[PDB]
Curated annotation (Swiss-Prot):
It is found in: Cytoplasm. HAMAP family: eIF_5A. Keywords: Cytoplasm, Hypusine, Initiation factor, Protein biosynthesis. One of its GO terms (molecular function) is translation elongation factor activity. InterPro entries: IF5A-like (IPR001884), IF5A-like_N (IPR048670), NA-bd_OB-fold (IPR012340), Rib_uL2_dom2 (IPR014722), Trans_elong_IF5A_hypusine_site (IPR019769), Transl_elong_IF5A_arc (IPR022847), Transl_elong_IF5A_C (IPR020189), Translation_prot_SH3-like_sf (IPR008991). This is Translation initiation factor 5A.
Amino acid sequence: MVIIMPGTKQVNVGSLKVGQYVMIDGVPCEIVDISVSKPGKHGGAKARVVGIGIFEKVKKEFVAPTSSKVEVPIIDRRKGQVLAIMGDMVQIMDLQTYETLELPIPEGIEGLEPGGEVEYIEAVGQYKITRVI
C-alpha cells in the first residue's frame, strides 16, 4: 500500500550490482555484498543483499527473489565550491545554480578548504560530499 516515496526507481533484485545503490528498510544504501542462491527447484533464486547507509553509518540487508522488484535511490552527482567550514557543516555553492547549501564535513578532508571544488551527491533529499578537488 501507499505510493512509492519520490526519488527512487524500481529494478529487479537480480540486476543489482555491488557498489551501486538500493533502498533497504527505507534507508538509501550502497551495496557492499551480494550472494545469489542456486535455483530453487523451479528456477527461482534468492539473493542476499547487504548495504551500508549512504548518509548514515548503518548496516542493512535483505533477502529476496532475484525476480522481485526493489527501489533504488536516484543519485544526482553535482559539483560545488567550498565557501566556509563552521562547526559540523561545510557551506558550499552549487556550480550550476549558484545556490548555497550546507553539508556534513566528509570523511576525506584533504584539500577541503574555502575555494576548493568538491563533488557531492543528493539522493532522496539528503546530501554528502563524495570527493575533494
